[PDB]
């Protein structure tokens, strides 16, 4: 109900107008969900990302409330953290950390990552996953578009618009919210899935990083879930070009048996991650992808 929605967001938001705290407004994206801007926290000089949303046209408001509540309580260095929010009438502003180096998608589509650079990205995402999973939060939409990169090679998870807070009482979910090509097979084959869906999704993202695309990208999304469900563990075009420990890591992420599939905590121990290059090694790939757009 729209009344209680507005009252609940009013309790969550900082009071007043965002232009009182943020100054250098420059539009960068268009909604859809909302007009996205960059700006500066004048006090600190931190560059920020602000989402502007007209609530009367936003279909699922329970989801923004959930997004902010979960993020606010779950701040992490490997997460693009929630900073602040403002409600002016029917107009919601959500202030976020801003990363200038684009998404992992641009890197995987414009450049060619070596295993040491892939190991670094996998480790950072897994640090974020571990933290989330230990706080009972499943992201549910792990894909390269949802990884933002700093100009310094920082790696951060974003878009928590689809996340689930589980409990010891309901530790499993059923809702099909993820992007099809990244979805774990159990999301379609059963009606009970846990945190390890993000692990599966991370494996398909490592495939993106190798091949430039998830498996079945060029299929209709409806047919992809049938293929995931019936083929199980996706095959690599050229497995022999990957080191053995990388293949092993992949097998651990894309394991069909959920119980066998590694948790984030376990995968952080994996020797594949020990070949990680310094994050700064990502900077020329970020620069080239940005240049290429």
UniProtKB/Swiss-Prot annotation:
Outcome reported for the amino acid change (mutating residue 145 to A): Abolishes autophosphorylation at Thr-175
Organism: Homo sapiens
Positions contributing to ATP binding: 28-36, 51, 97-99
Protein's name in the database: Serine/threonine-protein kinase PAK 1
Subunit composition and interactions: Homodimer; homodimerization results in autoinhibition. Active as monomer. Interacts with GIT1. Component of cytoplasmic complexes, which also contains PXN, ARHGEF7 and GIT1. Interacts with NISCH. Interacts with DVL1; mediates the formation of a DVL1, MUSK and PAK1 ternary complex involved in AChR clustering. Binds to the caspase-cleaved p110 isoform of CDC2L1 and CDC2L2, p110C, but not the full-length proteins. Interacts with ARHGEF7. Interacts tightly with GTP-bound but not GDP-bound CDC42/P21 and RAC1. Interacts with SCRIB. Interacts with PDPK1. Interacts (via kinase domain) with RAF1.
Residues of the full protein shown: 249 to 541 of 545
Gene Ontology molecular function: any one: ATP binding
GO cellular component labels: actin filament; axon; cell-cell junction; centrosome; chromosome; cytoplasm; cytosol; dendrite
EC number(s) per entry: 2.7.11.1
UniProt family annotation: Belongs to the protein kinase superfamily. STE Ser/Thr protein kinase family. STE20 subfamily.
Main location: cytoplasm
